[PDB]
Every structure is written in structure tokens, then in C-alpha cells.
Amino acid sequence: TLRDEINAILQKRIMVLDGGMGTMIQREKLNEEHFRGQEFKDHARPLKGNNDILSITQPDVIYQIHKEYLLAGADIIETNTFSSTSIAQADYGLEHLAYRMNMCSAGVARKAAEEVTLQTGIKRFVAGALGPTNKTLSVSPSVERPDYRNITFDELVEAYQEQAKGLLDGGVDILLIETIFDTANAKAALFALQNLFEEKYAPRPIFISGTIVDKSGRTLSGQTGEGFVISVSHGEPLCIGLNCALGAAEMRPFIEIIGKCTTAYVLCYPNAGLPNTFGDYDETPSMMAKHLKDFAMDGLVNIVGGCCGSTPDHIREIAEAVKNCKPRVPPATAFEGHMLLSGLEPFRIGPYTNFVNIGERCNVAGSRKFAKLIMAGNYEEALCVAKVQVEMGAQVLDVNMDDGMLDGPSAMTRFCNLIASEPDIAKVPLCIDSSNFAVIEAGLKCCQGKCIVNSISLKEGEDDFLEKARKIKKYGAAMVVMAFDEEGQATETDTKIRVCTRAYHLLVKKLGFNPNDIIFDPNILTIGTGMEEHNLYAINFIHATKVIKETLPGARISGGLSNLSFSFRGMEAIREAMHGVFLYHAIKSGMDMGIVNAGNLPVYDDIHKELLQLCEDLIWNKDPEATEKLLRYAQTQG
Questions:
Q1: By the 8 A CB rule, do 427 and 394 touch?
Q2: Helix 98-120 and helix 59-72: axis angle, to 10°?
Q3: Interior angle at CA 291, CA 288 and CA 292, nearest 5
Q4: What GO terms are given for molecular function?
Q5: Closest CA to 382 of 361, 410, 357
Q6: Do 381 and 289 belong together in one domain?
Q7: Does residue 461 share a domain with residue 414?
Q8: Does the annotation flag 27 for ligand binding?
Q9: Which of 368, 395, 428 is the last residue of a domain?
Q10: How would you classify the pairing of strands 265-269 and 303-305?
Q11: How far is CA 415 from the centre of its chain?
Q12: 204 annotated as a binding-site residue
């Protein structure tokens, strides 16, 4: 395939990518008449500055620019399709022509590519460029409306799907999502690409290149390089990296960081220096060539090029500089055995990571205080709840909006948009928890990073479970699987283990799911209810956790801790003590994370000795009177 052909080249030599097409377009000094080009004279809107319409009105100029770049030494050239979406063309009144413009640009690039390939004998590739558009999914258009968005996930998916269909019908060899200001836009583009690849089209290699705004080291949406890499890696890009808006000297640390975190190839095409007072770029071809040569001799990059300010002279110098340099060898494993999550910053859970606290208070179904805030429309206080949760030690936030009086997807969308507007909250990953899959989809379409989807199960059969898991995998998030099947909730050791094993083998064998993205919920259930049928639930969970951890490789264990102590409502001290004892024993058994009250978990050794003994008796069922003795202890505090 094309991926194998490109991979075989990337292990032998460093490739050179296109250059600055717009810079060469500006030197042509075209005007409105040239842009309109015999087909759009009577167009109702001005077309000057629309470089993408030049593939139909002035194809010769684009073709000669492509020829110049290919003869300079570029192995890959990008199509003139930076703004060739219906959304980006709406400003020019050409939103209906996106498919045709993409087809024409792909054809005009391909003609030059084949001509130069025949002339020189070196095969050259065409990359289909998908621009970031002027709309941001993760950033509000206006400051005073933080949860407001002027575009949705599905609209961007539709536009990107139309553009990519036009590019694939035109015959591009690579699909390149580049100049990514917003990672959510990149995820929408990847979603559209997956739709096209699963419906009709054979897959093509995908290149993903983000953009770092300045020395702060973050994208325009506020995400770091590692967080960006984690967020977009579910699309399995052949090459990843950064492009443009910075010079080589400033891009060196960030490109090095991105190189150390991914197993894919690293692509880097920065600006030709800084723009001067007049918008011109000062870096000469020799300085850019020596900077990228310093990049190559250090084993940092696999593909090089240039953004604005780059000319065929720059590309010629770069190609001659990196001709004999050894390509970067990607690491075989990047954080092996770790589960990767993201907010604005990466969150990784490894073998030596401590217990991960998932804040529980942002739960409409569970927390009545949070529900009362949500129904009244007071999302500002609901956001302060999450702020206090994170300030108190929560490493992941659980978000739930389940109620019969609420429309769940809209509330989830609003709350996720509001969370994304707060940097202190947006830096941690989110856990989308709901019994309705529509709310889960609404949450997944509103999150920039990589999240956790809580509690899909085999309750409604195998095919429904596989469909939901496939959708979750396409969105690229981790997910939790409850021990729930067609026979009901699993309440016993062997039933929990059987359901979890059956779910694990379905996801791995029949879906190719990443074992490090799989989390199991053996259903922590309430004890001390006064019913003998419920006396072994905690022991069952603790034993099943150990068996699952020692049997199913890569999987992790979670659960809702507060459900264990439901029979002792109002007795917060006893609930906290039982939570501490159960957490001690479960973490010793192999529990990795849980939805807990983050700041209210006592350490085992400073629990009161009498209360510790009572909680140990109740959890391990050492005393038939254990619940009665605990209630007597509660009563005798006055």
C-alpha cells in the first residue's frame, strides 16, 4: 500500500515537504480579474486573496509553482486546499464548490507530480491539506459567552468529510491535517476521515501537524505538545509533529518533546524566521538549511520543509543539507504499559502510579446539591464545584448529567464547553458518565483531550455492546465496562470475573481495542443493609479485582466507592472510615482508580482503632452484628 511505500522511505532518508505556496502566489501579483478567471466575473463577492480558487481560474500558476518546488528537491507537495471547506469558503460565496475545488487542486498537483517523477525518476507524493478553518470548537468566539460555540462537531465533520472526499477522488497519496489551532477540529477531521475510510474508500497515510503559538509551548486552544500528541494519536498517524508560526530555533525544544513521546515519525516545517515590520521573512535559505541540518544531525526529525517565508531556494538548500543525514529512529515503546489520558496536559497512569482519585461531586444523579444547581441553570456554581474538586486532589473529573427532568445531551454539551473555558479545570481529564449513550456522545464531541467513558456493558446484548465500543474507539477515548450482562448485575466473585473476561475477549479479539484503554467496574455494592444476602459484596469485589488484575493483561479496575457506604447516610465519619478501609484493601488487591470524594479519604493508619475494628468487621463480615455495632457506635457519640 501507500503507507508501506512511504514507511520504507522514511527509514532510509529524511524527506522534504513542499514549502510556502502562498509566498510564491503573492509574488505573482495577481488582482481581482486574475482571481475571477473567466468563470466568476459576475460573482457577487470579491475573490482577491482566495488562493484556493486559483486551481480552477489560474491552474497554470499553481502547476508551475508545484513544478518549481518539486524541482527544488521536495519529495512531497501539498494541494492548494488550505481553505477548501464549505465553512472557510462561506466568506467568498463559494461554499457550494468545495468538492470541485478540492478535486481540481488534487488534479493540478498530481499532474505536476507525475511529470516531475517521470523527468527525474524519483517518485514524488501529493499530500491533501486539510486546513483548520476559522472556527474553533474549544474556544468561544466571544469572551463574555464562555460556553458558546458558533460551530458544532457534526458540522465540521460534514465539511471535512466533503473536502476529504474531494481530495480522495482527486487521487492524493497523503492526507495532511496541518496548522491545527484547535485539537477538537483535528479530532473532527479524523472522525470524517474514519467515516470515509469505513464507508467506501481505502485508507491513505495521515499526517498530523500542530502549531505552537509562542515560547509558552501550547497550541492556540491551550494544549501542550504531549497533550496534543495523546489527543490525536487515536487516528494512528504515520507522521506527527509541528509546523510553522515559529522559527527553527524556538521550535527545537517542542519538536524534541514531541519526538520523545510518540512512536510515529516526526515532521517539522517551521517558518523562515520571524516576520519583519512589513510582513516579510528575514531568514535566508542558508540559515534555515543549517538550522534544519542541526535538527537532522541530532536525530530529531524525519520530514522537513517550510511554512510562510519559504521559497524553492529554501527548499533546495534544506534538501541539500539533509541529504546524507540519518533519519530519526522512533522509540519502540513510548510509556509502555501506561494508560494515556489528556486534558490540556497529559495524564498517564503506569504500574508505579498511585491510586487515581476521580472527583465524584459533579454528579446530577448522585449529588442532589449539584442537581439543584443544574436544574436552576446555575452553571457558574456548578463550575466552582469542579474547581474545588480539582483543588482538593481530584486527578480526573467525573461528569454526569442524568435526570428525567433534564435534557441530558444539551446539559452535557454546555457543561463541557464551560469546563473547557477554565484552564485550571481543563488541564485534567474528564470522565463522561451516563446511562444514556447520547449524553456520552455529546460529551465526547465537546472534549479536546482524551476522556474516560463510564459504564457501557453487556446489559442489552453483545451486538449493542460491540456497536457502542466501536463508536467509543472511533472517538478515541478510554472506556469502563461494568460487570453487567443479559442475566443481570454481577454480585458474586465468579460472575464478576466471567463477565469481565468475556467483555475483555470481545474488545480485544473482535474489535482490536487497546488493552490499556480498558477499565472494568466489578460493581462496588452497598453493604450493611440489614440483609444477609448483601454481606459478602465487598469481599466479592476485592477478590474479583485481584483475579481480574492477575488474569486479564493490561486491564485496569475502577468503581464507585461511595455506593459501599450508602446505608450510613449522614454518618459521614463512618462512611469515610469504611471508604478508607475498603480502599486500603482494594488497592492492596490491585485497584487502580475509583470515583471517590477526593479530599475526604482518610489514610488507614490514623483511623480510630475502635472504628477501624468495626469497619474491618463489617467489610470482611467477621461479625454478624457488625452493622448493628457500627450503628451503636454512631449513636453513642453524643
A1: no
A2: 40
A3: 85
A4: cobalamin binding; methionine synthase activity; zinc ion binding
A5: 361
A6: no
A7: no
A8: no
A9: 428
A10: parallel
A11: 18
A12: no
307 is in an annotated binding site: yes
Please give, one letter per residue, the 3-state secondary structure of 44-81. CCCCCCCHHHHHHHCHHHHHHHHHHHHHHCCCEEECCC
Resolution in Å equals 2.6
- Helix axis angle for 626-635 and 609-619, nearest 10°, is 150
Please tell me what DSSP assigns to residue 27: T
Say whether 363 counts as a known binding-site residue.
no
The position carrying cell 460555540 is 149
| Residue among 142, 229, 137, 224 at smallest CA distance from 184 | 137
Q: How many CA atoms lie within 13 A of 104 on its CB side?
A: 17
- CB atoms under 10 Å from CB of 121, counted, come to 7
The residues near 356 (Cβ < 8 Å, ≥ 6 apart) are 349, 395, 396, 592, 593, 594
C-alpha to C-alpha distance for 149 and 585, rounded to whole angstroms:
46
Experimental technique used to determine this entry: cryo-EM
Measured in Å, how far apart are the chain's first and last C-alpha atoms? 77
Q: What is the largest distance, in Å, between two alpha-carbon atoms of the chain?
A: 94
Q: For residues 524 and 494, give the distance between their C-alpha atoms in angstroms, rounded to a whole number.
A: 15
Amino acid at 168: L
433 appears as a binding residue in the annotation: yes
Instruction: Please report, as a single letter, which amino acid is at residue 150.
Output: N
Angle between helices 537-551 and 493-511 (to 10 degrees): 30
Nine cell digits for residue 562: 461511595
CATH code, domain carrying 103: 3.20.20.330
Contact 617, 626 (CB under 8 A): yes
Q: Phi, psi (5° rounding) for residue 583?
A: -65, -40
Q: For residue 48, give the C-alpha cell.
A: 482577491
**Residue 182 has what DSSP assignment?**
-
Of residues 74, 155, 180, the one with CA closest to residue 122: 74
Same structural domain, 414 and 480: no
Q: Is 521 annotated as a binding residue?
A: yes
| Residue-range definition of the domain harbouring residue 459 | 450-638
Question: Same structural domain for residues 423 and 543?
Answer: no
| Under 8 Å between Cβ of 353 and 432 | no
- Residue 13 counted as an annotated binding residue: no
111 backbone dihedrals φ, ψ, rounded to 5°: -60, -50
Among 53, 46, 52, residue whose Cα is nearest residue 32: 46
Residue 502 labelled as part of a binding site: no
The bridge status of strand 488-489 relative to strand 484-485 is: antiparallel
Q: Cα separation of 265 and 13, whole Å?
A: 12
Cell of 627: 452493622
Number of residues that make up the chain: 638
- CA angle in degrees (0–180, nearest 5) for 247-248-254: 100
